[PDB]
Structure 1
Amino acid sequence: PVKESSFVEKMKKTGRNIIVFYGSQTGTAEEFANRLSKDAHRYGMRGMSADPEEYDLADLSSLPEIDKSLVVFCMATYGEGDPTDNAQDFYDWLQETDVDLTGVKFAVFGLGNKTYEHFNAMGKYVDQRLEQLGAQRIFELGLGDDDGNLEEDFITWREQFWPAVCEFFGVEATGEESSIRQYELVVHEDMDVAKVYTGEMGRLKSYENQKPPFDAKNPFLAAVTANRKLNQGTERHLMHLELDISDSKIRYESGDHVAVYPANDSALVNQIGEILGADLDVIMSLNNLDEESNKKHPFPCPTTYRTALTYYLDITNPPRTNVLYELAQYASEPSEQEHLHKMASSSGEGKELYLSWVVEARRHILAILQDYPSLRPPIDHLCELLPRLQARYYAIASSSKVHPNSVHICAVAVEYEAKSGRVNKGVATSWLRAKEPAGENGGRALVPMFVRKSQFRLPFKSTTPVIMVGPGTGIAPFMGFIQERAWLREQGKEVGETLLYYGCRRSDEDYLYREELARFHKDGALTQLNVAFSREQAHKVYVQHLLKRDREHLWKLIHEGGAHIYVAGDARNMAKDVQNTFYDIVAEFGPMEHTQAVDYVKKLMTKGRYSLNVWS
């Protein structure tokens, strides 16, 4: 990327004394950064949030040139305790630099967690490194946990952070409070249709005029060739889709991920407009009131409210506390204005109400507008407050050795009864489920997508043994692994053992790729096809039980055969239980104490022989 000029100079030229950097992948850290940046005004200060990737952090050395200057880092962790893609350069710089940061004042809030090994790795590193470099910490490191409730961890940290800042710099709670807007509304009663965004992510008309290379800013509209129901029963809906990436020049390997940009439910969009009495077809733009910022709009503009609510805004996840806080002013019934205002509390009934009535109940914006009927905010402000609609990732279920021009997806459609009382539908899966191949040329079901390279890969040597554990939709990446493994064999190569440990409720309910797997097994592509049917008997039978059963042979492949272990699917419980079972296997056949088995297994991970492709 081409770097922006010195952030320190921008701050000087714009009267800013605090800058907040975000290492964000799915926007969580980015949003916290903006919240902190906006907070500054309430304390006699002025800040800006910034993407570290667009700057050279070596300029931190010049920050002391600004009086009462301070830098805050909101850093989330990804991969294997890595830094977010956008924080890679900063991370590389921190280890390599020897620059002296004497005079620099900092604070760090990490978006870390517990269902992962190095929980909050990045956050801890930045906070530690800046100090080593000579900078002085102005407030304790924050350790947020997305497994419980990050929002609340942030609220807690934030509540103590500002007072600490005011006391150190000797500033007053000046601003106190008062509704402030980041963007101004400009309605376009004309506008040449050719310059109105209709859902594209980057360059205007980029969805209609496709031009490579394609990525997150320029997605490729892949035609949906196939979309079929995978499960045999009716309990749920599991689907297999095939996206045509021919002529896109996109490359991929088994184990990578495919991201898609979905469209919200039209009915839901319609109702929001209706309940607010807003005309959704109004063409408009929301322009930053700060003419100096590079963030000219909250989303592609000009555009209609309908398009924004459909392709650019998140209207289904529970609104964050600051959003409800800003909306409170539009609730005409006192008790309702009060509940909304108190959602941002660090303790008490207001906090409990938020955790239960909003988060736990999974109340999206429309639900709140319906249940607190006096809340009728203007459409333009709400659009400024809502977070951006994020792309959804899927473990590519095919091998490029076999399907170089097609990317496959295996997904379960999300649809559940929320405690809010309504049925919530998953944005991307509901949208993907409705995509229909059409028929030859009559209608073209297109899916905006791009590929994100992962580190989940089959061994370089075809002879290395492979142990795959992926129950449920965790089978997704392994279909690619297996197609490729079978391919290698077909190509005359010597392939080591390939074992699949799969699981589903019942063979006649949701045994995904039943036919394909049976075929691969029959042809020898799969050395063993171990399937745990969890509900075909009174007790549970899970993949870990099969692993325990085969402990002796697996240990042989692991300790003597240099086998590679892969775990995909549920990251919350399955992955951990599977990990624990491997601990026990190693502990028995080592032999060695549990503590040592853990180390042994954690080493396999570091040496690239124990990989994960899990999610929640």
Structure 2
Amino acid sequence: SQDLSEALKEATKEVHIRAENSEFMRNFQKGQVSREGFKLVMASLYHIYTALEEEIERNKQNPVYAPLYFPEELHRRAALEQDMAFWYGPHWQEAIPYTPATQHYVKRLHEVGGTHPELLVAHAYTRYLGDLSGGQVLKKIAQKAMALPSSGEGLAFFTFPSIDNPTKFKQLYRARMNTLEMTPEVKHRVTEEAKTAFLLNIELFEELQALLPSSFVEKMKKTGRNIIVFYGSQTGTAEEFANRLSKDAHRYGMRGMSADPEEYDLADLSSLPEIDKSLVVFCMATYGEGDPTDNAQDFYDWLQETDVDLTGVKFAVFGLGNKTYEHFNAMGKYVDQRLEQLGAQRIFELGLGDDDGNLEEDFITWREQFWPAVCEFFGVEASSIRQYELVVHEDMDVAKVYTGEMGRLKSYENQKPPFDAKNPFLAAVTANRKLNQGTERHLMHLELDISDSKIRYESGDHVAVYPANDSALVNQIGEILGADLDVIMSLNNLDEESNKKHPFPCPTTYRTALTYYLDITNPPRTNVLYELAQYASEPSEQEHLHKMASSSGEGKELYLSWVVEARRHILAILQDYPSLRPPIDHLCELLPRLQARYYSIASSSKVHPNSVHICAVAVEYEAKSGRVNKGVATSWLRAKEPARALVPMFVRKSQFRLPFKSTTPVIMVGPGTGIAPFMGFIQERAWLREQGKEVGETLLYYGCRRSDEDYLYREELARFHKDGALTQLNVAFSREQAHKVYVQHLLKRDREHLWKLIHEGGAHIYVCGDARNMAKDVQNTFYDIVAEFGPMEHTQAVDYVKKLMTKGRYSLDVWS
């Protein structure tokens, strides 16, 4: 094609199929990889990436490669050195081999980097994009094939800690490649060089291959079990979840085991009701086009054409899936509905794990709410189960106690670089002023001083902040609970084979854990209610806490209506249920951890290198329980005054980026707080105009209610517009007349100019904000613009916009 990304993909179409169909790669996909061949390919990759990044640094400022210089995100030589130290011992330097094909690849890399840098892209692509695609799965295979530690040792080459979203980063990289200005003959040479790189990898793989040459029901009956957890897994994730679920069966009064439905025939499940209250749980991963895992095939087919009655069987299903597949969790949903229709009764709602989001936390949530449901559906053991042991340190020096820090002891005081999620930097609150002009809601512009923190950031990157719950809430909880909050204590995990030895940094006081470590504002989960049920003296409240710990009957309805809809925090529950008198150590054991909150950076580092600007709306509402609830992070930051008030924060890289060429036009859409990152963009753009660089058009599409209410940055945006930095300033006011006006209408208004920019000027579209379904609205608006002004059918216009998305030109930064 015309654009470099599409042209390279079309050129490598065939050699990619040939590469992934190489004998070694096919054996890798099936999981049949050996440690020796893996060491061989890893050493070869060490040599190859060393040569490649050597030439990259040699040409990191040559215009034929400069847009592709992402050392902090893509480079692999350090991770490959770590993996060589792992796989080849401490003296890996002299032990790793250097195969002839590896030498040929390195020689071609050096030839390119030395006398033909315009072709270097073709190699980088061939490697780096490839590492961001299949590489995410291969690791999950190796972790099981070679059995490596879960810490990722030996697989650091497959880990990109600075790439939060690999798909969006591949979009950005495609955009940077399309930035490369080149003659068509140079483009053809580049495609041929990408073919050459693929062929080098293919023959490397070829050479490396040349250097290699009973009834389960009656068994539970004969072993005394009542819980069995079948798993349908291919890369071990469902195995992990099923084994972790079986381990906790012995820790609730029952006992359970895992099971592979590839060695049993599940027709035996017909004779399962003959066990004194038993449960059958499935952890089913889905693959292909909604097809089951291989081991579950015999299961799946058996589910198809059968109707053997299994009345009395109690079951529960959890599905491992991924939202980006248009067959989401087909296997889990199928097993769930088929088991229901066959005559079994369900105990807990089917879980739908999302690999696109967070599968581990999803499974943790599902299990946390799952166990109390089974408990209160089968009866009770007086809730006689614990997880942490309390140890009170009545005499202890203060330099040994955690006072609120997140990483190492006293890390908040001896602040030493680097700073990240585990060691946040305590930024100084420079400014904290009100952006909102009215009185409906509070919107604030904070400035964090990170002067000597050595922290870098770009416009569009995010800043996360560790807040602290309101101290009045902590004091009230301590009073009503009748417990001393200044008691230095610790909670030690008695499950030895777990690195997680504490529910939060210990030793520390109950007050510190309630202020900085525990979320005491979000609605309580089912598990904490079922565990507090044993501390309710009145039966009219103990039975209420018991019923609110199940998925069936009036229980789930009452839980959703009284705790979820009303949004009652733990203090409100202790108030409305005066019988609850639990110990504070158990409450600390049960309460979830206080999470950090992210915000879009509202400043360009090119004009504010030692400060990070945040634009945030304060969360504060009247809950249906009468009580007024305050957002943790927003109120916490609002309380920060320049009279030194520190904020523990860190910076997470995002793929939201301005175009590399200053001449490229931008179309930013951000109603409300979604203006935050663009406030940075414009600044940088303005700065680029001050440096004498030719800057293209810059269009902003902001949206608010009334011009006198919540017009954010009105004066700054006006100054930007009159200085010429901001080309157009189109604001939609949703409450300034009869019919409301949104930014989609303003886009539809400027359809002709927008199309001319997109088609003739190669513009970049940006969308940001927490506005409801705003994404699809702007998306359909651009669909219609492209369909009309580019003589296109609707289908080809939607494909045009999705292509823009692929080329890294239609970017999103939405939240909720």
In 1, Cα distance between equivalents of 2:308 and 2:723: 60
Partner SS, residue 248 of structure 2: helix
Q: Which moved more, 1:422-431 or 1:138-147?
A: 138-147
Tell me the distance in 1 between the aligned counterparts of 2:453 and 2:514: 28
In the TM superposition, what whole-angstrom CA distance separates every residue of 1:83-136 from its partner, at most 9, and x where no partner exists? Answer: 999999999999999999999999995698989999889999999999999999
Deviation for aligned residue 1:597? 3.0
Q: Structure 1 residues 449, 80: closer, same or farther in 2, change over 3 A?
A: farther
Which deviates more from structure 2 when the two are superposed, residues 317-326 or residues 582-591?
582-591
* Larger CA deviation: 488-497 vs 116-125: 116-125
Q: Secondary structure, in 3 states, of the residue corresponding to 2:637?
A: helix
The alpha-carbon distance between structure 1 residues 37 and 474, as it changes in their structure 2 partners (threshold 3 A), is farther
**Equivalence map 1:533-552=2 (5 Å):** 533-552=733-752
8 A contact 2:516–2:594 mirrored in 1? yes
Q: 1:325–1:344: 8 Å Cα contact kept in structure 2?
A: yes
Deviation of 1:17 after TM superposition, in Å, equals 15
Deviation, 1:491, is 0.9
Asked whether the 8 Å contact 1:3–1:54 carries over to 2, the reply is no
Per mean C-alpha deviation after superposition, the further-off stretch among 356-365 and 571-580 is 571-580
CA contact (8 A) 2:376 2:550 kept: no
CA shift for structure 1 position 338: 1.7
Of 587, 590, 604, the residue aligned with 2:787 is 587
Alpha-carbon distance, 1:596 to partner: 3.5
**Counterpart-to-counterpart distance in 2, 1:382 and 1:343:** 18
C-alpha distance in 2, partners of 1:88/1:565?
45
Paired residues of 1:152 and 1:346 also in contact (CA < 8 A): no
**Distance change in 2, residues 1:575/1:276 (3 Å):** same
Cα distance change, pair 608–151 in 1 and its aligned pair in 2 (3 A): closer
- Secondary structure (helix, strand or coil) at the match of 2:521 reads coil
What is the rounded CA distance, in whole Å, between the counterparts of 1:27 and 1:535 in structure 2?
54
Alignment pair present for 1:573 and 2:782: no
Answer yes or no: is the 8 Å Cα contact 2:369–2:525 preserved in 1: no
TM-score (norm 1): 0.77
* Greater mean deviation of Cα atoms: 597-606 or 556-565: 597-606
Q: Does 1:273 align with 2:473?
A: no
Structure 1 position 49, deviation (Å): 14
Instruction: Tell me how far apart the structure 2 counterparts of residues 164 and 563 of structure 1 sit (CA, whole Å).
Output: 53
> Which shifted more, 107-116 or 357-366?
107-116
Q: In structure 2, do the counterparts of structure 1 residues 159 and 198 end up closer, same or farther at CA, with 3 Å as the change threshold? A: closer
- Please identify, of 598-607 and 463-472, the stretch whose mean Cα deviation from structure 2 is larger: 598-607
- The answer (yes or no) to whether the contact 2:232–2:292 under 8 Å persists in 1 is yes
CA distance in 1, matches of 2:214, 2:540: 49
Bigger drift between 530-539 and 552-561 goes to: 552-561
Q: Deviations over 1:380-430 (max 9, x none)?
A: 001000000001100000001111110110000111011011100000010
CA distance in structure 1 between the aligned counterparts of 2:234 and 2:723, rounded to whole angstroms: 41
Distance in structure 2 (CA, Å) of the matches to 1:187 and 1:293 = 22
Unaligned runs of 5+ in 2: 1-210
- Further displaced range: 341-350 or 110-119: 110-119
Contact map agreement 1:76 1:123 (CA 8 A) in 2: yes
Distance 1:220 1:3 in 2: 49
Report the Cα distance in structure 1 between the residues aligned to 2:576 and 2:662, rounded to whole angstroms: 59
Q: Look up the match of 2:805.
A: 605
> How has the CA–CA distance of structure 1 residues 159 and 181 changed in structure 2, closer, same or farther, with 3 Å as cutoff?
closer
Tell me, yes or no, if the aligned pair for 1:313 and 1:389 is still in contact at 8 Å.
yes
Q: Relative to 1, partners in 2 of residues 1:267 and 1:6: Cα closer, same or farther, differing over 3 Å?
A: farther
Where 2:588 maps in the other structure, the secondary structure is helix
Asked whether 1:76 is paired with 2:276, we answer no
Worse overlay, 466-475 or 15-24? 15-24
CA contact (8 A) 1:109 1:123 kept: yes
Q: Offset at 1:534?
A: 1.0
- Residue 558 of structure 1 deviates from its aligned partner by 1.5
* Kept after mapping to 1: 8 A contact 2:371/2:527: no
Q: Structure 1 stretch 580-589 or stretch 375-384: which is displaced more?
A: 580-589
Relative to 1, partners in 2 of residues 1:162 and 1:210: Cα closer, same or farther, differing over 3 Å? closer
Is the 2:431–2:447 contact (alpha carbons within 8 Å) kept by the matching residues of 1?
Answer: yes
SS in 2 for 1:40: coil
| 2:562 equivalent among 326, 349, 357 | 357
| CA shift in 2, pair 1:584/1:481, >3 Å | same
| 1:212-251 C-alpha deviation (Å, 9 max, x unpaired) | 1001110000000000000111111100011001110111
Q: Helix, strand or coil: the match of 1:42?
A: coil
Cα deviation for residue 553 of structure 1 reads 1.1
1:139-182 deviation line (CA, Å, top 9, x unaligned): 99942699999999989987999999999999999xxxx43111
Q: Is the 8 A contact 1:224 1:244 kept in 2?
A: yes
Change (3 A) 1:38 1:433: farther
Stretch of structure 1 that moved more, 377-386 or 569-578: 569-578
Partner SS for 1:53: coil
Shift of 1:559: 2.3
Change (3 A) 1:152 1:310: closer
Q: CA deviation at 1:518?
A: 0.5
Once the two structures are superposed, what CA deviation does each residue of 1:417-462 show, in whole Å capped at 9, x if it has no partner? Answer: 1101110000001010010012xxxxx0110010000001111111
Contact 2:373 2:549 in 1 (8 A): no
CA contact (8 A) 1:179 1:326 kept: no
Query: Greater helix percent: which structure?
Result: 2
Shift of 1:570: 1.5
Choose 2-11 or 354-363, whichever is displaced more: 2-11
> Which range moves more in the overlay, 3-12 or 419-428?
3-12
SS at 1:470 equivalent: strand
- Shift of the 395–74 alpha-carbon distance from structure 1 to 2, 3 Å rule, reads farther
Pick closer, same or farther for the CA change 1:200–1:523 going to 2, 3 Å.
same
Separation of aligned partners in 1, 2:338 and 2:470: 45
SS at match of 1:494: coil
* Equivalent residues of 2:602, 2:680 under 8 A apart: yes
For structure 1, list consecutive stretches of 5 or more residues without a partner in the other structure. 439-443
Flag the 1:138–1:265 CA change in 2: closer, same or farther, 3 A. Answer: closer
Q: Distance in 2 between matches of 1:53 and 1:279?
A: 55
> Which residue of structure 1 lines up, in the alignment, with residue 159 of structure 2?
none
Provide the aligned C-alpha RMSD in A.
Answer: 9.1
For 1:349-381, what per-residue CA distance to the aligned partner results, in whole angstroms no more than 9, with x for missing partners?
111111111111111111111111111211100
**What's the offset of the Cα at 1:552?**
1.2
Structure 2 Cα separation of the partners of residues 556 and 99 of structure 1 = 64
Q: Distance in 1 between matches of 2:213 and 2:597?
A: 29
Q: Tell me, what secondary structure is at the counterpart of 1:12?
A: helix
Cα distance change, pair 63–582 in 1 and its aligned pair in 2 (3 A):
farther
More divergent stretch after superposition (419-428 vs 15-24): 15-24
Cα contact 2:373–2:551 (8 A) shared by 1: no
Deviates more, 1:523-532 or 1:90-99: 90-99
SS in 2 for 1:86: coil
